[PDB]
Amino acid sequence: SKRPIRIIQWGCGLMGQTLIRTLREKGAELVGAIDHNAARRDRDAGEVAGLGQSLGVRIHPPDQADAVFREARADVCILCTRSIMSELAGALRVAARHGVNAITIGEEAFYPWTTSQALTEELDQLARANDCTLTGSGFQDVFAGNLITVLAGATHRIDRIVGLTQYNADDYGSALAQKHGVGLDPETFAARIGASNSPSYVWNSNEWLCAQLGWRVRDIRQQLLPTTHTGTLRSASLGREVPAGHATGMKAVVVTETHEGPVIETHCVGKLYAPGEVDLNEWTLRGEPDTTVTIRQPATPALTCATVLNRLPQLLAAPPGFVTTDRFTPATYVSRLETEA
Amino acid sequence: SKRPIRIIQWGCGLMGQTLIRTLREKGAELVGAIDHNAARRDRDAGEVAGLGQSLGVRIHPPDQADAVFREARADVCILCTRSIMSELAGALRVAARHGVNAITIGEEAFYPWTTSQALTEELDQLARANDCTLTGSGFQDVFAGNLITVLAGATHRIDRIVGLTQYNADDYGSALAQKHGVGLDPETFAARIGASNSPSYVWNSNEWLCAQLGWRVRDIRQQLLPTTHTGTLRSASLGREVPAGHATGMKAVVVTETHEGPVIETHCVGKLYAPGEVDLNEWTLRGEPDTTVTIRQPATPALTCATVLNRLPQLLAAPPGFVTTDRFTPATYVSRLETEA
Ligand SMILES: NC(=O)c1ccc[n+]([C@@H]2O[C@H](COP(=O)([O-])OP(=O)(O)OC[C@H]3O[C@@H](n4cnc5c(N)ncnc54)[C@H](O)[C@@H]3O)[C@@H](O)[C@H]2O)c1
Ligand SMILES: NC(=O)c1ccc[n+]([C@@H]2O[C@H](COP(=O)([O-])OP(=O)(O)OC[C@H]3O[C@@H](n4cnc5c(N)ncnc54)[C@H](O)[C@@H]3O)[C@@H](O)[C@H]2O)c1
């Protein structure tokens, strides 16, 4: 027989709400929900996710996470909270301590082996010790990952891979807007965002490409610059107007050099959109031959969530540890989130 | 403890010439060459492939194929000759009888399990008896194959996959132009091409998609129509002028219906090009979300040959038999075509 995959949603904001709705559509069961947001604490997860029915799954604050793991008998925790390993590791450790597989959309977690080596190695040991799998997925998994490596499989010689990924700061929560300097004046942007130069999502996803292609990274250079508009734009996530000339978000340019020779140059743009702007995804493999792929207006949030749910059967089957998706076969379409009973 | 992969090129026309040059750039060695073409017979394969320096590999006629396989001690035979299994079987039997892995760009061979079931089962048993693997690859492997299934892994619900593939009937040899009815008057086209309704490349590649997605085919419907131009066009492959109103090639529409419900609808055009026409590759996964992917002017011949060479390490490692690429992980970029001792 088959049974529902049993999921704990940790982070019940925009992406977590989409996942609660879509996991139920595919026959999975929400068995726990954790969020620290004062407005969502104590509410039913079905209500917060916009469903027509109460699920009888109360949103618990993270200080009660152990009790929800013990009670829930979950197969997997999906973690949609923060972007950087230091801010994900706490939740991933709770999942691993309970022997529960976890998959996060936190962008650094896609490939954190060099940017947060100590935390990743510690979680890898802890996941191995508790016979469960931790991984990072989301939009990058295909759209800055296997889309490129599938095309590399048809390429004679790669000299350079050149990428552009653009997403709408207002499709996501305050964390993403903050990381992108949305609403900062030019000086504060340069001082807080530019100067600290924290790895953009494509620093890690470029490393993921090199790992899957069998290349060794020899140098990484990133520049973070503010984006701008000629008019006022509004950030719904931060609930403030952004004057013309203030940062509407940021453009990251990452150049990843290899010992082998090929280079990966990726532009990563997260900003408020002026009228008629849309998400972009375009890659060129330069060499023999040159190949250019364009996704026409990728539905970035939907593609992020669908990839996570399609990964779950593989996550359940995966060997224990912190296992990044460069070590998996590509996500396949799964009609039903049901598992052998 | 590694050595060059040893290749026999069977078919030294346009694709075979590209393969002889490219295989060497990736570290493989040409150990045999077969072609029935009176103009290439007895010439050096390096010379025919446009190299500056002779390789000391004479092109042999296929009546001498056994003797060249016995001498060559090949790892792989690349077969670039004909399109349909009945016309490839002769060469695939020679490869298999000599324990040599074979990969063909013959379009039916991509997924021949239902269109040529008996030949496929016969070759499977012959390959298993000789500890070697036969497979079909080429442009379809990614561009009507794993490009679609990688995007399916980011999709919540698939209702329909709709594809358009257009290629230049003049980039390939006479066999492809003939399969497409190039230069036929409308009556002869109807009588020979339209009426027989032989499987277009996307009949087999849509079956390949269903196999990889875990769908069961319930019906396949194809219509073949001639393409036309308003002016005379020239086929370099046939050395023929094609007057306005004669078939410049053919457009296939294949609708592949599954038991599960999703449908794959693929439009496939192979023809002579009027001024400004280019190759096209565009796919839409309709459902949730809708995703459209476009390849800008794919370098279809270069992509065909590069995919074949990238597949070779997998072909060597593959279990014995007729093993279609739906059973492999996607082709990966290979810098070095080497194998153990
Ligand atoms: N493709 C991708 O990988 C991808 C795409 C979408 C979003 N993201 C990332 O995922 C995260 C969530 O995005 P979102 O748009 O849903 O944001 P959101 O702000 O709408 O977030 C979900 C919730 O997480 C809560 N939260 C944060 N830290 C928590 C913790 N330790 N414990 C409990 N609750 C916690 C917040 O209160 C919020 O309610 C962000 O870091 C974003 O950058 C990644
Ligand atoms: N992506 C793909 O899968 C793909 C793309 C390119 C070509 N093809 C197919 O592959 C074939 C080769 O294409 P090409 O452009 O190299 O054509 P080509 O005419 O240049 O082919 C090479 C030569 O093979 C010879 N040949 C045919 N049958 C033979 C046999 N039994 N023994 C020895 N030699 C034989 C022919 O005389 C021909 O000149 C065509 O049928 C074409 O339709 C498929």
PDB file of N, CA, C and O in Angstrom, chain A residues 22 25-26 142-143 146-147 150-158 288-289 291-296 299 302-303 306-307 310 329 331-333, chain B residues 22 25-26 142-143 147 150-158 282 288-289 291-296 299 302-303 306-307 310 329 331 333:
ATOM      1  N   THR A  22       0.177  23.173  -1.749  1.00  0.00           N
ATOM      2  CA  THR A  22       0.551  22.285  -2.868  1.00  0.00           C
ATOM      3  C   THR A  22       0.873  20.871  -2.364  1.00  0.00           C
ATOM      4  O   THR A  22       0.580  19.942  -3.079  1.00  0.00           O
ATOM      5  N   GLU A  25      -2.386  19.113  -2.078  1.00  0.00           N
ATOM      6  CA  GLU A  25      -2.907  18.801  -3.431  1.00  0.00           C
ATOM      7  C   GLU A  25      -2.302  17.499  -3.951  1.00  0.00           C
ATOM      8  O   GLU A  25      -2.973  16.844  -4.679  1.00  0.00           O
ATOM      9  N   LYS A  26      -1.050  17.153  -3.630  1.00  0.00           N
ATOM     10  CA  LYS A  26      -0.374  15.941  -4.117  1.00  0.00           C
ATOM     11  C   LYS A  26      -0.540  14.754  -3.168  1.00  0.00           C
ATOM     12  O   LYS A  26       0.123  13.708  -3.431  1.00  0.00           O
ATOM     13  N   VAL A 142      17.104  23.485 -10.481  1.00  0.00           N
ATOM     14  CA  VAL A 142      17.057  23.412 -11.960  1.00  0.00           C
ATOM     15  C   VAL A 142      17.653  24.702 -12.565  1.00  0.00           C
ATOM     16  O   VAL A 142      18.537  24.583 -13.449  1.00  0.00           O
ATOM     17  N   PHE A 143      17.178  25.865 -12.145  1.00  0.00           N
ATOM     18  CA  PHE A 143      17.293  27.125 -12.919  1.00  0.00           C
ATOM     19  C   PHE A 143      18.645  27.824 -12.738  1.00  0.00           C
ATOM     20  O   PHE A 143      18.886  28.795 -13.448  1.00  0.00           O
ATOM     21  N   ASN A 146      20.734  22.066 -12.730  1.00  0.00           N
ATOM     22  CA  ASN A 146      20.574  20.991 -13.734  1.00  0.00           C
ATOM     23  C   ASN A 146      20.142  21.475 -15.114  1.00  0.00           C
ATOM     24  O   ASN A 146      20.487  20.799 -16.095  1.00  0.00           O
ATOM     25  N   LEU A 147      19.474  22.624 -15.252  1.00  0.00           N
ATOM     26  CA  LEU A 147      19.231  23.128 -16.618  1.00  0.00           C
ATOM     27  C   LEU A 147      20.563  23.338 -17.338  1.00  0.00           C
ATOM     28  O   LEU A 147      20.691  22.996 -18.518  1.00  0.00           O
ATOM     29  N   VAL A 150      22.505  19.804 -17.852  1.00  0.00           N
ATOM     30  CA  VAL A 150      21.845  19.028 -18.940  1.00  0.00           C
ATOM     31  C   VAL A 150      22.299  19.585 -20.299  1.00  0.00           C
ATOM     32  O   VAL A 150      22.675  18.792 -21.157  1.00  0.00           O
ATOM     33  N   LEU A 151      22.358  20.910 -20.471  1.00  0.00           N
ATOM     34  CA  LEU A 151      22.853  21.492 -21.725  1.00  0.00           C
ATOM     35  C   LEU A 151      24.356  21.247 -21.909  1.00  0.00           C
ATOM     36  O   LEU A 151      24.776  21.007 -23.070  1.00  0.00           O
ATOM     37  N   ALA A 152      25.128  21.270 -20.822  1.00  0.00           N
ATOM     38  CA  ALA A 152      26.576  20.982 -20.885  1.00  0.00           C
ATOM     39  C   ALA A 152      26.795  19.572 -21.444  1.00  0.00           C
ATOM     40  O   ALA A 152      27.791  19.360 -22.152  1.00  0.00           O
ATOM     41  N   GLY A 153      25.857  18.653 -21.220  1.00  0.00           N
ATOM     42  CA  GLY A 153      25.907  17.265 -21.740  1.00  0.00           C
ATOM     43  C   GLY A 153      25.816  17.212 -23.263  1.00  0.00           C
ATOM     44  O   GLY A 153      26.181  16.176 -23.815  1.00  0.00           O
ATOM     45  N   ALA A 154      25.384  18.287 -23.942  1.00  0.00           N
ATOM     46  CA  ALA A 154      25.279  18.374 -25.416  1.00  0.00           C
ATOM     47  C   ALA A 154      26.376  19.265 -25.998  1.00  0.00           C
ATOM     48  O   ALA A 154      26.324  19.569 -27.180  1.00  0.00           O
ATOM     49  N   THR A 155      27.393  19.623 -25.205  1.00  0.00           N
ATOM     50  CA  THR A 155      28.389  20.658 -25.573  1.00  0.00           C
ATOM     51  C   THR A 155      29.735  20.003 -25.811  1.00  0.00           C
ATOM     52  O   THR A 155      30.111  19.110 -25.019  1.00  0.00           O
ATOM     53  N   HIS A 156      30.407  20.365 -26.895  1.00  0.00           N
ATOM     54  CA  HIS A 156      31.747  19.789 -27.197  1.00  0.00           C
ATOM     55  C   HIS A 156      32.815  20.389 -26.289  1.00  0.00           C
ATOM     56  O   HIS A 156      33.573  19.657 -25.623  1.00  0.00           O
ATOM     57  N   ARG A 157      32.866  21.704 -26.264  1.00  0.00           N
ATOM     58  CA  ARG A 157      33.896  22.394 -25.450  1.00  0.00           C
ATOM     59  C   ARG A 157      33.200  23.571 -24.769  1.00  0.00           C
ATOM     60  O   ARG A 157      32.537  24.348 -25.481  1.00  0.00           O
ATOM     61  N   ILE A 158      33.364  23.696 -23.446  1.00  0.00           N
ATOM     62  CA  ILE A 158      32.852  24.893 -22.729  1.00  0.00           C
ATOM     63  C   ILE A 158      34.027  25.808 -22.388  1.00  0.00           C
ATOM     64  O   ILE A 158      34.950  25.377 -21.703  1.00  0.00           O
ATOM     65  N   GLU A 288      32.103  25.406 -28.070  1.00  0.00           N
ATOM     66  CA  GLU A 288      31.710  24.722 -29.310  1.00  0.00           C
ATOM     67  C   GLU A 288      30.600  23.751 -28.969  1.00  0.00           C
ATOM     68  O   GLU A 288      30.819  22.826 -28.195  1.00  0.00           O
ATOM     69  N   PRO A 289      29.375  23.940 -29.483  1.00  0.00           N
ATOM     70  CA  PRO A 289      28.892  25.172 -30.070  1.00  0.00           C
ATOM     71  C   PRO A 289      28.516  26.142 -28.928  1.00  0.00           C
ATOM     72  O   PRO A 289      28.545  25.777 -27.749  1.00  0.00           O
ATOM     73  N   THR A 291      25.451  27.740 -27.083  1.00  0.00           N
ATOM     74  CA  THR A 291      24.022  27.447 -26.849  1.00  0.00           C
ATOM     75  C   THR A 291      23.425  28.461 -25.897  1.00  0.00           C
ATOM     76  O   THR A 291      24.014  28.707 -24.825  1.00  0.00           O
ATOM     77  N   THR A 292      22.329  29.093 -26.289  1.00  0.00           N
ATOM     78  CA  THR A 292      21.594  30.007 -25.399  1.00  0.00           C
ATOM     79  C   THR A 292      20.214  29.432 -25.088  1.00  0.00           C
ATOM     80  O   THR A 292      19.494  29.068 -26.010  1.00  0.00           O
ATOM     81  N   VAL A 293      19.912  29.333 -23.798  1.00  0.00           N
ATOM     82  CA  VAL A 293      18.583  28.913 -23.281  1.00  0.00           C
ATOM     83  C   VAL A 293      17.930  30.094 -22.568  1.00  0.00           C
ATOM     84  O   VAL A 293      18.568  30.791 -21.750  1.00  0.00           O
ATOM     85  N   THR A 294      16.650  30.291 -22.844  1.00  0.00           N
ATOM     86  CA  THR A 294      15.810  31.343 -22.223  1.00  0.00           C
ATOM     87  C   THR A 294      14.589  30.659 -21.620  1.00  0.00           C
ATOM     88  O   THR A 294      13.923  29.890 -22.371  1.00  0.00           O
ATOM     89  N   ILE A 295      14.322  30.905 -20.338  1.00  0.00           N
ATOM     90  CA  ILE A 295      12.976  30.617 -19.762  1.00  0.00           C
ATOM     91  C   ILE A 295      12.164  31.905 -19.890  1.00  0.00           C
ATOM     92  O   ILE A 295      12.590  32.935 -19.386  1.00  0.00           O
ATOM     93  N   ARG A 296      10.993  31.817 -20.517  1.00  0.00           N
ATOM     94  CA  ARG A 296      10.140  32.998 -20.764  1.00  0.00           C
ATOM     95  C   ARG A 296       9.348  33.265 -19.487  1.00  0.00           C
ATOM     96  O   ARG A 296       8.451  32.465 -19.209  1.00  0.00           O
ATOM     97  N   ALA A 299       7.972  31.355 -13.522  1.00  0.00           N
ATOM     98  CA  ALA A 299       7.112  31.526 -12.328  1.00  0.00           C
ATOM     99  C   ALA A 299       7.924  31.154 -11.072  1.00  0.00           C
ATOM    100  O   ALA A 299       7.748  30.045 -10.508  1.00  0.00           O
ATOM    101  N   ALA A 302       6.594  29.476  -7.767  1.00  0.00           N
ATOM    102  CA  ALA A 302       5.935  28.182  -8.043  1.00  0.00           C
ATOM    103  C   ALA A 302       6.992  27.139  -8.381  1.00  0.00           C
ATOM    104  O   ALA A 302       6.880  25.987  -7.923  1.00  0.00           O
ATOM    105  N   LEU A 303       7.975  27.508  -9.211  1.00  0.00           N
ATOM    106  CA  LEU A 303       9.066  26.591  -9.615  1.00  0.00           C
ATOM    107  C   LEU A 303       9.896  26.252  -8.369  1.00  0.00           C
ATOM    108  O   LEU A 303      10.283  25.074  -8.202  1.00  0.00           O
ATOM    109  N   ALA A 306       7.624  23.710  -6.282  1.00  0.00           N
ATOM    110  CA  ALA A 306       7.372  22.432  -6.989  1.00  0.00           C
ATOM    111  C   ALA A 306       8.632  21.579  -6.977  1.00  0.00           C
ATOM    112  O   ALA A 306       8.542  20.329  -6.837  1.00  0.00           O
ATOM    113  N   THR A 307       9.813  22.189  -7.148  1.00  0.00           N
ATOM    114  CA  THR A 307      11.072  21.433  -7.150  1.00  0.00           C
ATOM    115  C   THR A 307      11.269  20.780  -5.775  1.00  0.00           C
ATOM    116  O   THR A 307      11.634  19.602  -5.703  1.00  0.00           O
ATOM    117  N   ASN A 310       8.930  17.771  -5.542  1.00  0.00           N
ATOM    118  CA  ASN A 310       9.393  16.676  -6.427  1.00  0.00           C
ATOM    119  C   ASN A 310      10.637  15.989  -5.861  1.00  0.00           C
ATOM    120  O   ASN A 310      10.798  14.781  -6.117  1.00  0.00           O
ATOM    121  N   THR A 329      20.664  12.443  -8.713  1.00  0.00           N
ATOM    122  CA  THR A 329      20.149  12.575 -10.097  1.00  0.00           C
ATOM    123  C   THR A 329      19.160  13.734 -10.085  1.00  0.00           C
ATOM    124  O   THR A 329      18.638  14.081  -9.015  1.00  0.00           O
ATOM    125  N   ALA A 331      15.890  16.187 -10.192  1.00  0.00           N
ATOM    126  CA  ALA A 331      14.512  16.076  -9.670  1.00  0.00           C
ATOM    127  C   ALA A 331      13.672  15.554 -10.848  1.00  0.00           C
ATOM    128  O   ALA A 331      13.900  15.986 -12.008  1.00  0.00           O
ATOM    129  N   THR A 332      12.798  14.594 -10.573  1.00  0.00           N
ATOM    130  CA  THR A 332      11.832  14.116 -11.569  1.00  0.00           C
ATOM    131  C   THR A 332      10.450  14.554 -11.112  1.00  0.00           C
ATOM    132  O   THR A 332      10.181  14.669  -9.897  1.00  0.00           O
ATOM    133  N   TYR A 333       9.547  14.730 -12.059  1.00  0.00           N
ATOM    134  CA  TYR A 333       8.127  14.971 -11.795  1.00  0.00           C
ATOM    135  C   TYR A 333       7.505  13.791 -11.033  1.00  0.00           C
ATOM    136  O   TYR A 333       7.553  12.683 -11.507  1.00  0.00           O
TER     137      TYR A 333
ATOM    138  N   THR B  22      36.177  15.763 -33.566  1.00  0.00           N
ATOM    139  CA  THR B  22      35.843  16.081 -32.152  1.00  0.00           C
ATOM    140  C   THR B  22      36.284  14.971 -31.205  1.00  0.00           C
ATOM    141  O   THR B  22      36.666  15.283 -30.088  1.00  0.00           O
ATOM    142  N   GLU B  25      39.784  15.542 -30.215  1.00  0.00           N
ATOM    143  CA  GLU B  25      39.950  16.720 -29.335  1.00  0.00           C
ATOM    144  C   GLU B  25      39.616  16.339 -27.885  1.00  0.00           C
ATOM    145  O   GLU B  25      40.096  17.021 -26.993  1.00  0.00           O
ATOM    146  N   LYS B  26      38.835  15.287 -27.671  1.00  0.00           N
ATOM    147  CA  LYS B  26      38.438  14.892 -26.299  1.00  0.00           C
ATOM    148  C   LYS B  26      39.278  13.698 -25.843  1.00  0.00           C
ATOM    149  O   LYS B  26      38.952  13.116 -24.819  1.00  0.00           O
ATOM    150  N   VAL B 142      19.012  15.434 -25.374  1.00  0.00           N
ATOM    151  CA  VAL B 142      18.689  16.625 -24.558  1.00  0.00           C
ATOM    152  C   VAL B 142      17.470  17.337 -25.143  1.00  0.00           C
ATOM    153  O   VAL B 142      16.538  17.611 -24.335  1.00  0.00           O
ATOM    154  N   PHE B 143      17.470  17.668 -26.442  1.00  0.00           N
ATOM    155  CA  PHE B 143      16.587  18.752 -26.973  1.00  0.00           C
ATOM    156  C   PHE B 143      15.181  18.254 -27.311  1.00  0.00           C
ATOM    157  O   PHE B 143      14.322  19.091 -27.665  1.00  0.00           O
ATOM    158  N   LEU B 147      16.131  17.941 -21.571  1.00  0.00           N
ATOM    159  CA  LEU B 147      15.731  19.356 -21.347  1.00  0.00           C
ATOM    160  C   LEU B 147      14.306  19.413 -20.803  1.00  0.00           C
ATOM    161  O   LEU B 147      14.049  20.156 -19.856  1.00  0.00           O
ATOM    162  N   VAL B 150      14.108  17.608 -17.133  1.00  0.00           N
ATOM    163  CA  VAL B 150      14.715  18.457 -16.087  1.00  0.00           C
ATOM    164  C   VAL B 150      13.707  19.545 -15.683  1.00  0.00           C
ATOM    165  O   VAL B 150      13.521  19.765 -14.480  1.00  0.00           O
ATOM    166  N   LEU B 151      13.012  20.155 -16.657  1.00  0.00           N
ATOM    167  CA  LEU B 151      11.998  21.175 -16.350  1.00  0.00           C
ATOM    168  C   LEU B 151      10.761  20.551 -15.691  1.00  0.00           C
ATOM    169  O   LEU B 151      10.207  21.195 -14.791  1.00  0.00           O
ATOM    170  N   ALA B 152      10.396  19.329 -16.067  1.00  0.00           N
ATOM    171  CA  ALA B 152       9.286  18.581 -15.444  1.00  0.00           C
ATOM    172  C   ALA B 152       9.572  18.401 -13.949  1.00  0.00           C
ATOM    173  O   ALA B 152       8.640  18.479 -13.142  1.00  0.00           O
ATOM    174  N   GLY B 153      10.850  18.278 -13.546  1.00  0.00           N
ATOM    175  CA  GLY B 153      11.212  18.153 -12.135  1.00  0.00           C
ATOM    176  C   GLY B 153      10.964  19.411 -11.323  1.00  0.00           C
ATOM    177  O   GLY B 153      10.949  19.300 -10.077  1.00  0.00           O
ATOM    178  N   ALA B 154      10.691  20.579 -11.967  1.00  0.00           N
ATOM    179  CA  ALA B 154      10.355  21.842 -11.293  1.00  0.00           C
ATOM    180  C   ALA B 154       8.864  22.182 -11.441  1.00  0.00           C
ATOM    181  O   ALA B 154       8.464  23.303 -11.116  1.00  0.00           O
ATOM    182  N   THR B 155       8.050  21.215 -11.872  1.00  0.00           N
ATOM    183  CA  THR B 155       6.655  21.462 -12.236  1.00  0.00           C
ATOM    184  C   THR B 155       5.733  20.805 -11.207  1.00  0.00           C
ATOM    185  O   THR B 155       5.975  19.630 -10.865  1.00  0.00           O
ATOM    186  N   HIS B 156       4.703  21.519 -10.770  1.00  0.00           N
ATOM    187  CA  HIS B 156       3.753  20.989  -9.758  1.00  0.00           C
ATOM    188  C   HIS B 156       2.759  20.022 -10.416  1.00  0.00           C
ATOM    189  O   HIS B 156       2.563  18.896  -9.883  1.00  0.00           O
ATOM    190  N   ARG B 157       2.169  20.426 -11.539  1.00  0.00           N
ATOM    191  CA  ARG B 157       1.182  19.610 -12.261  1.00  0.00           C
ATOM    192  C   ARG B 157       1.444  19.757 -13.754  1.00  0.00           C
ATOM    193  O   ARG B 157       1.503  20.904 -14.218  1.00  0.00           O
ATOM    194  N   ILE B 158       1.583  18.656 -14.466  1.00  0.00           N
ATOM    195  CA  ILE B 158       1.696  18.659 -15.950  1.00  0.00           C
ATOM    196  C   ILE B 158       0.393  18.190 -16.593  1.00  0.00           C
ATOM    197  O   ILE B 158      -0.025  17.053 -16.365  1.00  0.00           O
ATOM    198  N   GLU B 282      11.562  24.930 -29.023  1.00  0.00           N
ATOM    199  CA  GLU B 282      10.742  25.606 -28.019  1.00  0.00           C
ATOM    200  C   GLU B 282       9.754  24.595 -27.432  1.00  0.00           C
ATOM    201  O   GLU B 282       9.083  23.867 -28.180  1.00  0.00           O
ATOM    202  N   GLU B 288       0.733  23.581 -13.844  1.00  0.00           N
ATOM    203  CA  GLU B 288       1.053  24.539 -12.772  1.00  0.00           C
ATOM    204  C   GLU B 288       2.516  24.368 -12.419  1.00  0.00           C
ATOM    205  O   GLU B 288       2.926  23.283 -12.004  1.00  0.00           O
ATOM    206  N   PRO B 289       3.389  25.369 -12.598  1.00  0.00           N
ATOM    207  CA  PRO B 289       3.103  26.562 -13.384  1.00  0.00           C
ATOM    208  C   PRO B 289       3.229  26.181 -14.868  1.00  0.00           C
ATOM    209  O   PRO B 289       3.646  25.058 -15.195  1.00  0.00           O
ATOM    210  N   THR B 291       5.496  26.642 -17.955  1.00  0.00           N
ATOM    211  CA  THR B 291       6.903  26.994 -18.246  1.00  0.00           C
ATOM    212  C   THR B 291       7.176  26.856 -19.740  1.00  0.00           C
ATOM    213  O   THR B 291       6.919  25.825 -20.308  1.00  0.00           O
ATOM    214  N   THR B 292       7.702  27.925 -20.329  1.00  0.00           N
ATOM    215  CA  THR B 292       8.179  27.913 -21.725  1.00  0.00           C
ATOM    216  C   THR B 292       9.689  28.078 -21.740  1.00  0.00           C
ATOM    217  O   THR B 292      10.216  29.013 -21.149  1.00  0.00           O
ATOM    218  N   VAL B 293      10.358  27.183 -22.459  1.00  0.00           N
ATOM    219  CA  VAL B 293      11.822  27.214 -22.704  1.00  0.00           C
ATOM    220  C   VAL B 293      12.075  27.372 -24.195  1.00  0.00           C
ATOM    221  O   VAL B 293      11.422  26.705 -25.028  1.00  0.00           O
ATOM    222  N   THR B 294      13.038  28.226 -24.523  1.00  0.00           N
ATOM    223  CA  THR B 294      13.436  28.484 -25.927  1.00  0.00           C
ATOM    224  C   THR B 294      14.939  28.317 -26.025  1.00  0.00           C
ATOM    225  O   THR B 294      15.643  28.879 -25.168  1.00  0.00           O
ATOM    226  N   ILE B 295      15.392  27.500 -26.973  1.00  0.00           N
ATOM    227  CA  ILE B 295      16.821  27.491 -27.369  1.00  0.00           C
ATOM    228  C   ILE B 295      16.953  28.447 -28.566  1.00  0.00           C
ATOM    229  O   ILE B 295      16.264  28.256 -29.573  1.00  0.00           O
ATOM    230  N   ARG B 296      17.847  29.435 -28.470  1.00  0.00           N
ATOM    231  CA  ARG B 296      18.027  30.418 -29.567  1.00  0.00           C
ATOM    232  C   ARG B 296      18.907  29.811 -30.665  1.00  0.00           C
ATOM    233  O   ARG B 296      20.050  29.592 -30.431  1.00  0.00           O
ATOM    234  N   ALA B 299      22.521  24.940 -32.536  1.00  0.00           N
ATOM    235  CA  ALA B 299      23.546  24.446 -33.477  1.00  0.00           C
ATOM    236  C   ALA B 299      23.365  22.941 -33.620  1.00  0.00           C
ATOM    237  O   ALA B 299      24.173  22.141 -33.067  1.00  0.00           O
ATOM    238  N   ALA B 302      26.136  20.230 -34.385  1.00  0.00           N
ATOM    239  CA  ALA B 302      27.196  20.234 -33.355  1.00  0.00           C
ATOM    240  C   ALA B 302      26.666  19.634 -32.043  1.00  0.00           C
ATOM    241  O   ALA B 302      27.391  18.822 -31.417  1.00  0.00           O
ATOM    242  N   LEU B 303      25.421  19.949 -31.700  1.00  0.00           N
ATOM    243  CA  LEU B 303      24.756  19.417 -30.480  1.00  0.00           C
ATOM    244  C   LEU B 303      24.572  17.917 -30.648  1.00  0.00           C
ATOM    245  O   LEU B 303      24.795  17.154 -29.666  1.00  0.00           O
ATOM    246  N   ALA B 306      28.167  16.290 -30.227  1.00  0.00           N
ATOM    247  CA  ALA B 306      28.743  16.476 -28.879  1.00  0.00           C
ATOM    248  C   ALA B 306      28.022  15.579 -27.853  1.00  0.00           C
ATOM    249  O   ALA B 306      28.664  15.015 -26.971  1.00  0.00           O
ATOM    250  N   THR B 307      26.701  15.409 -27.999  1.00  0.00           N
ATOM    251  CA  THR B 307      25.939  14.574 -27.067  1.00  0.00           C
ATOM    252  C   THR B 307      26.422  13.137 -27.214  1.00  0.00           C
ATOM    253  O   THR B 307      26.609  12.454 -26.187  1.00  0.00           O
ATOM    254  N   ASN B 310      29.768  12.770 -25.439  1.00  0.00           N
ATOM    255  CA  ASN B 310      29.592  12.876 -23.970  1.00  0.00           C
ATOM    256  C   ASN B 310      28.964  11.594 -23.392  1.00  0.00           C
ATOM    257  O   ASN B 310      29.232  11.297 -22.225  1.00  0.00           O
ATOM    258  N   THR B 329      21.287   8.241 -16.375  1.00  0.00           N
ATOM    259  CA  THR B 329      21.276   9.649 -15.911  1.00  0.00           C
ATOM    260  C   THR B 329      21.627  10.523 -17.117  1.00  0.00           C
ATOM    261  O   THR B 329      22.175  10.023 -18.103  1.00  0.00           O
ATOM    262  N   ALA B 331      23.297  12.917 -19.978  1.00  0.00           N
ATOM    263  CA  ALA B 331      24.666  13.046 -20.490  1.00  0.00           C
ATOM    264  C   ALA B 331      25.336  14.169 -19.691  1.00  0.00           C
ATOM    265  O   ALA B 331      24.659  15.167 -19.367  1.00  0.00           O
ATOM    266  N   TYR B 333      28.951  16.664 -19.353  1.00  0.00           N
ATOM    267  CA  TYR B 333      30.108  17.179 -20.097  1.00  0.00           C
ATOM    268  C   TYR B 333      31.365  16.377 -19.734  1.00  0.00           C
ATOM    269  O   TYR B 333      31.723  16.284 -18.530  1.00  0.00           O
TER     270      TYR B 333
END
